[PDB]
């Protein structure tokens, strides 16, 4: 759900679109995430590992 579960009814939303929202919230455009999605996913997996 993202952040909608803590401010009212839960709203379904894909995780990449939530990441795009979170990147746009700080000023970074969503193009760098919608294009270089595999690199961000690999970096996140490496960090979690």
């Amino acid at each position: 759900s993202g952040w909608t579960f803590g401010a009212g009814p839960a709203l379904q939303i894909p995780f990449p679109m939530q990441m795009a929202y979170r990147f746009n919230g700080i000023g970074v455009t969503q193009n760098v995430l919608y294009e270089n999605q595999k690199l961000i996913a690999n970096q996140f997996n490496s960090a979690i590992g």
Binding site: P16, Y34, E35, N36, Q37
Partner: peptide, 19 residues
């Protein structure tokens, strides 16, 4: 490179006014 994008058409607010 975008994964999950679909094909659709967008509107132009200048073509009908010019043509």
């Amino acid at each position: 490179v975008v994964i999950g994008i679909v094909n659709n058409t967008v509107y132009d607010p200048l073509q009908p006014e010019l043509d």
